[PDB]
Design a binder for these strands. Structure first.
Lengths: 185, 96, 251, 130, 260
RNA sequence: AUUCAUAAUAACUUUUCGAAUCGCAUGGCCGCUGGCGAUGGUUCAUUCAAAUUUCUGCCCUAUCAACUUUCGAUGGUAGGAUAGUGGCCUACCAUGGUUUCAACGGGUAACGGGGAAUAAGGGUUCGAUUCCGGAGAGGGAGCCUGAGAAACGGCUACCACAUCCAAGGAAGGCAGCAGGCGCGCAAAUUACCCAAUCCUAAUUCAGGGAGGUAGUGACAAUAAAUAACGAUACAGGUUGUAUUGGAAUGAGUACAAUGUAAAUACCUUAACGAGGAACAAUUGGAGGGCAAGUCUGGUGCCAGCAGCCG
RNA sequence: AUCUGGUUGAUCCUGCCAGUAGUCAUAUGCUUGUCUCAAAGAUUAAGCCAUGCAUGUCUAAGUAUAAGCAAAUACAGUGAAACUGCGAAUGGCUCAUUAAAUCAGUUAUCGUUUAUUUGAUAGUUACAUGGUAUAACUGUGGUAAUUCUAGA
């Protein structure tokens, strides 16, 4: 038969289910950033767990070990590109100090709110899913898209929507017609 | 899966006081004979002799559970319909 | 060895017929249209008329069938025909909704006296066609409805497709029915012929189905009450030996 | 608005007497462009006869406005007609679909013939006499 | 199995062919021929996957049956004919010639050569022996047998062969200071000069090689192919001259220089 | 490293091979001579392979401590047989071989490996199943053809099942694909096609249930709708609670084009498609472990609840 | 790299039971709108099987008088049947048996066979021989019946 398609799971569940202090801290994040699930938080802490594991391993190697230089620099290069790590903190020991809020800050949903365009994180999410926002030329309709530092200059309304310059939408058009029909008595 | 032979009530262990409702079942694949508990009160009206029932373990890996002496199994489905659906009035059971 | 032992009763052209009852749940349907579509899959036009009971041999499966159609005017007559069946075939309409005051009450009542086995069938599904995807919306609705009463069943067959209609016919021939406990601990027969002889004597002949008959036992006929029999004979003879009980209600 | 057609990765291929390239199409404010229209515009740019042009495999970008596909242009109509697959020639109307019987019927005929040895003009007589 | 096998499942194919995982269940099985299966390159893989002149296995056959392709000067029409190391491939239309030679990554490169160099190939001497009636012969790595060699030719030497006529015209002895090409194992595709050889009776001899950056490495003698004198190859070398680079060096060159 | 490669001498042999074959072209010299190919053939080398073979490595059991040698067990000499080595087999001879560093016997709901799950580290449990190797085609035995088989979509016999019949006879092997019965807690369509991947043949063309396409499919996995924003009234340090208004959009339907062997669907798009936006999210809980009720009605140690304490 | 409830009048221990998290681990219940991707009669019975299909093959180039078709007096296009040659030992399915056996890594043939591919290689012994030969075909037949086959 054809070779197998590979796949993997992308989140992990906390091990104590009803810890009151954890439950409160999670709900504050969901309200601040407009998430719908706890799963959306578990996804980010799962990613950060793998990043720390990799860095923590390399730090046991000798300095000037060729592997530590090659893979260490790649890891840092990659986190700076998305703006999770500040260009001042460009050192492997600062990678261990990252926290969940640093990743949430870079989602398309929150960027579209900091720039204007939207007047709340809840208003922002609806605009993205309804195909009004473009990044460069491409329409993007996924809220969790991570905005690279070069892309921020190019977020704007899509050319094929109202707000962006096209014809009015279906409901606006219906109303104008019915009024004209009554006025065109 | 098994066939219902007869209907029983089991006196609970002291200090509790109740007559709990059980059935004798003969397993189709072995012929071995077993007693099973019927959950959810009035549900005993849904089972009658020569009905066919699906049984599950009573959660304690072969030990008896709670008040009930010597009962290791519970009824899950009767005549192909689940007792939970009957009790909540979501389905109907045909006779035979 | 036990499986052969059980199937022997229907083993072949010498074996007993399975008794099929057709019950349309809507006045739209006409039960004879159901029977027609089935026999097309038998691949023998010689099988295929102002009467309501039919004997059929399907050589394709070496199978004997007896088909009963009740008169859908008489609610009590419907229950009686179903009481003797091995399979009940329920007809559903794609066009017209089942009536709460009649169609539902048939299903609900038949369950509560006991049913040997059941099949759900549709025969007019093309009548709502715009595209086949519109047909499937209706069929899914009917499957959900039928499964409310017979939750062991997950499929409703469309007889307008040759593959489905052939699938139904095979089931009626090849599959054993469930028993009915209160029925099979008695004897029962469906009459093939009935005749009278003079002060009266009534002759019936047919095939025994239940636990069996004995000439010393009484005999019930549903509309007329209890009666007594004087002979049994096999088509050895078994006269009533009269060291027997009699038509009396006390002591 | 105007359609703009661009061609990329152009390779000349003497071994099959053709040029082959990627086709990239910009089409704001319309759903897409028909393969029939593309063949006409490519014919004039490459100075070819229309029957020598073949075009296939298009997908349009998410959010619309662009499409990408693949194209071939042959040195003559005669060469196109020998190297091109028959199923494409049918799409262009250069060839007719053949009326073979269904796959299962063809197989069943074959197996019946296997049971006859020789040509069977005899035996046919013999059965008629029986 | 009751006999020889005719199929080759994908994933079981040699990795250096660079076939993708998902395009099908099977891979082209090379026919019997001059080169071992595990180290050949079928023609279908060359024409379709490397040069892109064909889109399908069907189109490849349409090319070969026109007789446009010849290997070592002879027309071949078998789709799975096993070309291999040092072979010359000629496409007369387009007017192109190729020699199959390794990348320093260990893959067959697309290396174009002039119409002059296409006249000949090198061959490693695998054995030398007397034939019937006492006529001596040599066997090369691609399975040619050549009558009446020069008496000085010995095993592991290399021989220059004219593709027309098939006669020997020159040879180079295995010796310290020669250039060698590595044709197997972990160091496949590297080039350097012989430092010295270790004798191990009843075992495998080992050879110490030094490259022009004066890195040193060791391989079994079986994997060594002599190709010329110090600084004078008898063939054109592929781009990059067989110099192995560390992953750090490669990263710099790309993004600093070519990445502008 | 050889009684190697190879050469020589005397003979043997029921006497091996050493072209009575086919397509295209029609040149040279005064009826002789000539080109490019196809198919066969002896031996050597090569390639695709096969057979045998060295070293080290396996789960539970002593309520298995001695095992093998009549009827090959360990070794020697000669022969037979084999493609070939060898107790592989035969004749004669010797009395050996394994073991508390666990032999021999018994069990496995035991095909081996690459691997999988869970992990601070060290570990424990699993691997019928997409790749590699082995074995089998109801159970045992035997054999023909052939480079290759102890072949089962080849044959022969016996054992167990079982089909047709004019009762004389004849025929059989789904642990291939689809489908049926039985079993059971437990598993899909008697569909379309050689367009792709590759394989076979005298072959570019024929064939391929190998393979691909669609149907069934909450096994497991990825992304992600079920509403956003104003005004008014009231309360409050720009945030809550309720009367009212325009905007935005896909679920779905559909002209068309694209996709495809032909289709279906995805991506794209004219027209249509929200005010209880009825275009109505469920599944388990509220004494403790363990997030969350001194609320209100019923009932009678009963019906019931309860993993545990109750 | 984490634990909590239960033996007493109350306490500190030993110790187990219950709780907690996962599973490319199966089954089952209730519920179910969209896109991509995807396992699937192994477990029990290596149990039994109706029907259809899964293996054939021709080039300029072995054999043509079809009484086939289509239009250079031996033949000459296309082409059924049949002879000849090659293939059917690959693929696909399953896990019953099997515990130094199979298998893994590592070796050997100076211990042997090898269709096919590729390269070499036979001056040494009639202007072209038989039927001790036949299929397809023509024609006469047997049997309830099969991919039965006899006589000329």
């Amino acid at each position: 038969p054809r070779a197998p398609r590979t796949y993997s799971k992308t989140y992990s569940t906390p091990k104590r289910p009803y810890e009151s202090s954890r439950l409160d801290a999670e709900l504050k994040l969901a309200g601040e950033f407009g998430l719908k699930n706890k799963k959306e938080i578990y996804r980010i802490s799962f990613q950060l767990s793998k990043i720390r594991r990799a860095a923590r391993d390399l730090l046991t190697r000798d300095e000037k070990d060729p592997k530590r230089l090659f893979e260490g620099n790649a890891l840092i290069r990659r986190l700076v590109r998305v703006g999770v790590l500040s260009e001042d903190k460009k050192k492997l020991d600062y990678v261990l100090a990252l926290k969940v809020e640093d990743f949430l800050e870079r989602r398309l949903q929150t960027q579209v709110y900091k720039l204007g365009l939207a007047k709340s994180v809840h208003h922002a999410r609806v605009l993205i899913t309804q195909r009004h926002i473009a990044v460069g030329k491409q329409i993007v309709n996924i809220p969790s898209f991570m905005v690279r530092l070069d892309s921020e200059k190019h977020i704007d309304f899509a050319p094929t929507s109202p707000f962006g310059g096209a014809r009015p939408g279906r409901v606006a058009r219906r109303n104008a017609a019915r009024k004209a029909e009554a006025s065109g008595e | 899966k098994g066939i219902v032979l007869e209907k029983l009530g089991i006196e609970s262990k002291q200090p509790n006081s109740a007559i709990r409702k059980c059935v004798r079942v003969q397993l189709i694949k072995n012929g071995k004979k077993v007693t099973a508990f019927v959950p959810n009160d009035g549900c005993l009206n849904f089972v009658d002799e020569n009905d066919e029932v699906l049984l599950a373990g009573f959660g304690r890996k072969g030990k008896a559970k709670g008040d009930i002496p010597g009962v290791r199994f519970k009824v899950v489905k009767v005549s192909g319909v689940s007792l939970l659906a009957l009790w909540k009035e979501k389905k109907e059971k045909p006779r035979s | 060895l036990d499986s052969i032992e059980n199937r022997k009763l229907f083993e072949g052209k010498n074996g007993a017929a399975k008794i099929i009852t057709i019950v349309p749940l809507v006045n739209d349907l006409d039960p004879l249209d159901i029977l027609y579509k089935l026999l097309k899959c038998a691949d023998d036009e010689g099988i295929m008329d102002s009467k309501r009971i039919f004997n059929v041999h399907i050589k394709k499966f070496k199978s004997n069938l007896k088909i009963i159609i009740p008169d859908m005017t008489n609610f009590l007559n419907i229950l009686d025909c179903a009481k003797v069946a091995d399979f009940v075939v329920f007809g559903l309409s794609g066009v017209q909704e089942v009536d709460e005051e009649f169609g539902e009450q048939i299903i609900r009542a038949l369950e509560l006296q006991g049913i040997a086995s059941y099949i759900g069938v549709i025969s007019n599904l093309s009548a709502v066609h715009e595209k086949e995807k519109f047909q499937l919306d209706v069929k899914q609705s009917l499957e959900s409805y039928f499964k409310h009463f017979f939750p062991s069943e997950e499929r409703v067959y469309n007889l307008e497709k040759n593959s489905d209609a052939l699938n139904v016919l095979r089931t009626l021939c090849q599959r054993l029915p469930r028993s009915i406990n209160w029925r099979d601990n008695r004897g029962y027969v469906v009459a093939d012929f009935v005749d009278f002889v003079e002060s009266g004597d009534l002759v019936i002949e047919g095939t025994v189905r239940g636990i069996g008959f004995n000439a010393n036992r009484l005999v019930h006929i549903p509309d007329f009450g209890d009666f007594q029999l004087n002979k049994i004979e096999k088509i050895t003879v078994f006269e009533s030996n009269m060291n027997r009980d009699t038509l009396d209600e006390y002591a | 608005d105007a359609v703009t057609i661009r061609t990329r990765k152009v390779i000349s291929n003497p071994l099959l007497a053709r040029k082959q390239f990627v086709v990239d199409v910009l089409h704001p404010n319309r759903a897409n462009v028909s393969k029939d229209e593309l063949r006409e515009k490519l014919a004039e740019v490459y100075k070819a006869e229309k029957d020598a042009v073949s075009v296939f495999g298009f997908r349009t970008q998410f959010g619309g406005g662009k499409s990408v596909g693949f194209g071939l242009v042959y040195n003559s109509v005669a060469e196109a007609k020998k190297f091109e697959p028959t199923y494409r020639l049918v799409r262009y109307g250069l060839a007719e679909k053949v009326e073979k019987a269904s796959r299962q019927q063809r197989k069943q005929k074959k197996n019946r013939d296997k049971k006859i040895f020789g040509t069977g003009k005899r035996l046919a007589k013999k059965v008629a006499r029986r | 199995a009751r006999g020889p096998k005719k199929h080759l499942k994908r994933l079981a194919a040699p990795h250096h062919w660079l076939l993708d995982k998902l395009s099908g269940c099977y891979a082209p099985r090379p026919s019997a021929g001059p080169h071992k299966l595990r180290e050949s390159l079928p023609l279908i893989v060359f024409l379709r996957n490397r040069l892109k002149y064909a889109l399908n296995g069907r189109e490849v056959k349409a090319i070969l049956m026109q007789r446009h392709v010849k290997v070592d000067g002879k027309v071949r029409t078998d789709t799975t004919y096993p070309a291999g190391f040092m072979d010359v491939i000629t496409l007369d239309a387009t007017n192109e010639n190729f020699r199959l030679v390794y990348d320093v990554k260990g893959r067959f490169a697309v290396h174009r050569i002039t119409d002059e160099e296409a006249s000949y190939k090198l061959g490693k001497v695998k054995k030398v022996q007397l034939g019937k009636k006492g006529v001596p012969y040599v066997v090369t790595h691609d399975g040619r047998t050549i009558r009446y060699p020069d008496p000085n030719i010995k095993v592991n030497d290399t021989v220059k062969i004219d593709l027309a006529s098939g006669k020997i015209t020159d040879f180079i002895k295995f010796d310290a200071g020669k250039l060698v090409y590595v044709t197997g194992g972990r160091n496949l595709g590297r080039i350097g000069t012989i430092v010295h050889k270790e004798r191990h009776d009843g075992g495998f001899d080992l050879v110490h090689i030094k490259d022009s950056l004066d890195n040193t490495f060791v391989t079994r003698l079986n994997n060594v192919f002599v190709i010329g004198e110090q600084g004078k190859p008898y063939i054109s070398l592929p781009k990059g001259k067989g110099i192995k680079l560390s992953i750090a060096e490669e990263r710099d060159r790309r993004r600093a220089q070519q990445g502008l």
